[PDB]
Design a protein around this nucleic acid. Structure first.
Ligand SMILES: [Mg+2]
Ligand SMILES: [Mg+2]
Ligand SMILES: [Mg+2]
Ligand SMILES: [Mg+2]
Ligand SMILES: [Mg+2]
Lengths: 773, 774
DNA sequence: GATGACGATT
DNA sequence: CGCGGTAGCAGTAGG
DNA sequence: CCTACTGCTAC
DNA sequence: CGCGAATCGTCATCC
């Protein structure tokens, strides 16, 4: 056969056709690895080869067949989309598969062009979890007998290899979970190197030779059982409610008996693979696509922010998107393709009416797209550059707080935090709408002034509502509003029953048969609207032309209707929820919300209203003010002790001439003999992520270095006057922190209110400059 | 008209069709900006709009029509030019007629638009190549249309520089004129430079300004007697005319020509070809043809210099797209990331026949195979690069890099103009690319021959040393530089002075088979097999071809038809330059060389032999060893002086109680009164790129920071005793440097031999490790 | 039935 | 997870 | 002769 | 300088 991305095995379809394997890989780069391994003259005699092995590309993610089939009774009818899929239709041609056959007898199977198919997917969760599950679901849906009789197989490859400086042999892992456990449980990985294999093509020469030296001893066969049929419907059927049930809990790990049994005979039940590999993907896809309720960010957008703060710290000089993306993927350990990261960066910096972000993390330099095309008319990442919206970020995400956040560790190293805790509840302040596994995500930004009133009343005791709001929250009866935002909207909003709705604006003119549309409902792109209207034969009966005179950010569509306005009212219908002229031009939109978010420790959580998201975020922000303030108190005490000792050394440096002492170790003794405290200076000047316990526990690992590396410029008494000034100001700050801790209703309430005013100033300023500053 | 990537102008094809403009842009990103400008209702009615403007993208670089017409019959377009989606799409939108000549005002009034406006990027690729190609399209078919102003241009800046406070930036239209302007400035410490790689890079307040002044920034092209010949020079089928034209630099326009252009906004095509198109072509030669000193193009030099920076603290491996981003930022890369990621991958490939016998990087992952010519490499997201630091440390000494002349991009230091490696790298690799005017092709010279020549030139004790120096003086060959055979299991033969490459085969009459066990030099396996079966004459005697090649090796099974072996010998003649199986299976290959390189001064140079490239490289490497040694002498003198002062303070630190002085000034007064020299410590500790005289004049004009920033631990007698040794080792090294300078046959000859031995050991190690060094 | 959307992924 | 179009020069080949 | 490949560095 | 095939979960509309 002549199929694209297919390299035939020599004996395929011939006398020895049942001795051949079809290696299905994720893409061309993975095919290049398989080609290299099958072309080894020094792997023999059991080394695989093109005598009995073929290659075919799966084209990345294949199509879910279970969701494109209609049952018919006297029959399973395949849809167009499934019938005309090039990748799957190529696999059917290469294998000589027949949808009418059920392949139960070894006669019936011996007319196939290959003996089996071996899924050589990448070990990333997308590969073994998603793509492999889709392939298993394809065969189970059409030819379940082939799974019973061992036709569907798998090649196991590592996902992580960690090498030691000594040992010539690495430690190999097949799951990020099991490596991360191994990494934290290790003492330190100081002389190791960790390598994550996002695709097959990442394996090096001597690594490829090892994998093919043990090829068939890494090939596993799939098996079927009664439990499989229902599980395939759970994970890949049409009812997402089951996914909502399955994804409430984490994966149930394999027992020591199941693991040992599987590896001894190299057989994997389809039910176990769906429960472990496929499910682990499904939970992971939720973490990628569903944002956290604390900061309203996905993992990519949080890595992009954390990387942005690092990259745009020294300079904040603009950098092109493709350059910034590489920095993010390197310093924040990003295990996926650069295409999806570069696009996320652009979507994170877009600022137009209807955009996802009312308060974008970055400033966009260049053509970043327009409302009229929904932001998809942005320039390629090679031209446009981003730049941190540093005034907003510095106020919304305080730098002091970031040391105290819990952090994700990828490849054995610290990466982005598990979550940020912004000063205002950012998860309800922006727009969002994307699907995921099991749950959909959709948010419509809440009004800024309502958020301020509510949050400020919770913290400001002098606010009239302070008694009363806390009493209301304990009994879950809400008194203050959280209404949809009206910013960047030239229309109005209405609330009917259980939904809020969005309304455009229009103007009629009787002198010359025109309707001028000057606003569309929230998040509606102009071009698609015009297209969608002219695609109506009902309406276009009465329109002769539609002309678009909108400006870059505004909307102005002139619609030339003979006297037909009367019919429109008759042909359509007028209610208290929608004018007929507003039915004629679809100027109405329903604010459907799907408030599903991710938990701090991990998992899905469903919210019923925007109020609960605010109430759930407040304790984390309340508690975080304690740690900063508590830690500042602890560090200030130590810095005072250190500076006081240094000023005492400067006062004793002239008589206590260090010039005469022989060694570094001697000089450390004479400072101890003079009553100087041994101090762990590096931790005092730069505590970084040190917890309070670590602070007090390691502050005594002294070395007297804080004196010995003191420069001569510090001996000058003006530098010493600045030190004594610094001591007095730190001693003054210490007493304000003690008061700020003993504050009501909780430590740091006044600090929270100050920073709330600071964030508001940044938003007001950004809003007046179109987030250009 | 329903043309792809075309947004119809409202009055196109109507009464007011001659008032409508077609904006031709470089691509989609540029189209989106024009859309933003055409859709401003506050740009004043002055601003243009979609009432009278259309957009179409040119698809990047358009097709050269002048080389796809026979036209002698008038204007006969070949299939490829007839079926060009971009060009025939512009003909569809405008309603152009190849049979019309557009002399009269009927014929121009039968056009769907009034003119076309080239809104190309201001980089030399845009206005020089693409616009010149577009002008050549209209000039070739409808010269009258250019006479009457149908072809136009929108002028846009290429660089903008902003000063703190000042609101209006200074704008440039040529990188050369900015680079000149930058050097004459005092310092760019309070400026910011910005390069516009495409139109889409302009920001909001910039786009609003450009469209506010749209009508007065559009220029019209005009024709003259000299234009027709110049269009044939630059875009015709005689490369010899390009070879003559590109010998010379661009001749800048006089203030009279500049004033005339800007006063009426009309540009002669001859002038545009002479400045913009030529400036591109000269630049393209520098981009694509490598320098004869280091054998690198401009991009590969940026990739090396960027690699040394990236992999300096940590030779930790990085993905190609990550490293590519690093290079484009730190080395100022003004082009697309696609060709940069590709150049990086080709720079790290190591397989038989690959361009590089001595790759700059180590490749971790699938970096491609001999069988597909390296086009089966993984996507840049999977594979990783890593500096071949042992090779880089020896071939490109770090000390030398401080002394090279450097390129300055955006007013800042980038990659060097050229490296001067320890061995002549331009004759040590394989190369083959076209360019403007000249082609480039080299076949790597044998390493043992390279060593013999270079070692004899430097080692006075070599028997051939006296005799070799006589040979360079008269350009006569005494020693051989034969093509390299490394990673080649075939044969090489010499006829006249041309080398040929031979595969290897084994015949088998027991079962009518020819087994090919090697292909000629640089011949890719897959393309070779196809080339054989696409000839029906050869396939007459072939029933099957089977490919059993291994990772680097070759084993192609060729099965013949029953009684063909006797008939092949007659049908395929047996000469002394190939027998009848090497003609039959095309197992011979000629090492054609095109030794054209780029000069240090910025021009092309043609060489006649590989000897001349070696002879031309030797002076640069000889002088660099001198310059290096002289500067070390200068720095060592200063560091000794500085350390001597520091140790004298440590012995005087007890009496000179800095504790009692109030400010640094007092401290500066009291040390000077004690005879301490004011020193420019930063320059003495870190000379960086300071020239020797530049060094000599400022190192003794600084202050007392070398004293004031001394920490207390240095006052300990152990720390001052370590300094006194450090001074003593520098004083010994100073006397050794004076010996190396007083050396024969030239200063630093013995060091050159040392570093040659270091380079060979590194190459031997890489060759034993498959260029993994692990 | 058939055909669209998003963000973060292959 | 992949995909093309274009220039430039000069060799080869096939037709 | 015409037309089609092939490379690297670009759009 | 540009091009595409796929998933997922609700929502929409045209015939
Ligand atoms: Mg993958
Ligand atoms: Mg992780
Ligand atoms: Mg003293
Ligand atoms: Mg450009
Ligand atoms: Mg330059």
């Amino acid at each position: 056969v002549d199929v694209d991305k297919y390299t035939r095995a020599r004996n395929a379809g011939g006398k020895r056709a049942q001795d051949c394997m079809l290696l299905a890989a994720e893409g061309d780069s993975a095919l290049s690895l398989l080609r290299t391994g099958l072309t080894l003259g020094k792997s023999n005699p059991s080394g695989p080869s093109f005598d009995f092995c073929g290659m075919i590309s799966l084209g990345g993610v294949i199509m879910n067949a279970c969701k494109k089939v209609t049952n018919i009774t006297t029959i399973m009818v395949r849809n167009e989309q499934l019938t005309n899929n090039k990748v799957l239709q190529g696999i059917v041609q290469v294998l000589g598969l027949d949808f009418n056959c059920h392949y139960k007898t070894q006669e019936e199977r011996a007319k196939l062009r290959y003996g089996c198919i071996v899924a050589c997917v990448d070990q990333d969760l997308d590969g073994c979890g998603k793509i492999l599950g889709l392939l298993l679901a394809y065969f189970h849906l059409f030819w379940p007998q082939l799974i019973i009789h061992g036709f569907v197989k798998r090649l196991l490859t590592p996902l992580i290899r960690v090498y030691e400086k000594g040992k010539t042999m690495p430690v190999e892992f097949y799951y990020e979970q099991e490596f991360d456990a191994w990494a934290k449980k290790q003492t330190s990985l100081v002389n190791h190197t960790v390598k994550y294999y996002k695709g097959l093509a990442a394996h090096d020469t001597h690594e490829v030779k090892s994998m093919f030296k043990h090829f068939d001893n890494m090939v596993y066969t799939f098996t079927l059982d009664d439990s499989a049929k229902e599980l395939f419907h759970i994970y890949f059927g049409g009812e997402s409610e089951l996914r909502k049930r399955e994804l409430c809990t984490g994966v149930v790990p394999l027992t020591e008996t199941q693991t040992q049994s599987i590896h001894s005979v190299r057989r994997i039940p389809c039910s176990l693979h769906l429960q472990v590999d496929t499910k682990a993907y499904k939970l992971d896809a939720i973490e990628r696509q569903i944002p956290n309720f604390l900061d309203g960010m996905t993992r990519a957008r949080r890595k992009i922010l954390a990387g942005g703060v690092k990259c745009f710290a020294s300079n904040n000089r603009e950098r092109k998107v493709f350059q910034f993306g590489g920095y993010v993927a390197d310093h924040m350990f990003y295990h996926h393709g650069d295409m999806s990261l570069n696009t996320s960066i652009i979507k994170a910096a877009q600022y137009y009416p209807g955009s996802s972000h009312l308060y974008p993390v970055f400033i966009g330099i260049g053509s970043f797209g327009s409302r009229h095309l929904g932001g998809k008319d942005a320039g390629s990442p090679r031209y446009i550059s981003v730049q941190l919206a540093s005034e907003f970020i510095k106020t919304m995400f305080p730098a002091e707080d970031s040391w105290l956040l819990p952090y994700v560790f990828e490849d054995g190293q610290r990466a982005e935090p598990e979550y940020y805790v912004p000063v205002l509840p950012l998860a309800i302040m922006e727009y969002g709408a994307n699907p995921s596994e099991g749950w959909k995500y959709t948010t419509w930004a809440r009004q800024l002034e309502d958020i301020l009133a509510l949050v400020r009343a919770y913290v400001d005791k002098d606010n009239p509502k302070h008694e009363l709001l806390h009493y209301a929250i304990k009994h879950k009866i809400t008194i203050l509003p959280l209404r949809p935002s009206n910013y960047n909207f030239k229309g109005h909003l209405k609330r009917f029953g259980q939904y809020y709705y969005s309304y455009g604006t229009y103007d009629i003119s009787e002198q010359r048969n025109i309707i001028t549309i000057t606003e569309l409902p929230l998040r509606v792109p102009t071009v698609a609207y015009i297209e969608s209207i002219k695609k109506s034969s009902n309406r276009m009966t009465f329109i002769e032309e539609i002309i678009d005179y909108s400006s870059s950010e505004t909307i102005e569509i002139l619609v030339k209707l003979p006297n037909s306005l009367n019919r429109i009212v008759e042909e359509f219908k007028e209610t208290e929820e929608q004018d007929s002229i507003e039915n004629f031009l679809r100027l109405r939109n329903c604010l459907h919300s799907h408030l599903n978010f991710v938990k701090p420790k991990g998992g899905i959580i469903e919210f019923n209203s925007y109020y609960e998201i605010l109430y759930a975020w407040l304790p984390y922000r309340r508690e975080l003010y304690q740690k900063r303030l508590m830690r500042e108190h602890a560090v200030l005490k130590l810095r005072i002790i250190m500076e006081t000792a240094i000023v005492r050394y400067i006062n004793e440096s002239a008589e206590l001439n260090l010039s005469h002492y022989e060694d570094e170790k001697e000089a450390s003794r004479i400072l101890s003999e003079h009553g100087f405290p041994p101090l762990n200076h590096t931790l005092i000047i730069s505590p970084e992520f040190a917890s309070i316990e670590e602070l007090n526990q390691k502050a005594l690992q002294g070395c007297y270095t804080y004196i010995l590396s003191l420069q001569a410029r510090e001996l000058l008494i003006a530098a010493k006057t600045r030190r004594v000034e610094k001591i007095k100001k730190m001693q003054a700050r210490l007493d304000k922190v003690e008061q700020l801790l003993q504050e009501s209703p909780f430590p740091g309430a006044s600090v929270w209110l100050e920073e709330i005013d600071a964030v508001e100033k940044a938003i007001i300023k950004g809003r007046n400059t179109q987030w250009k500053f």
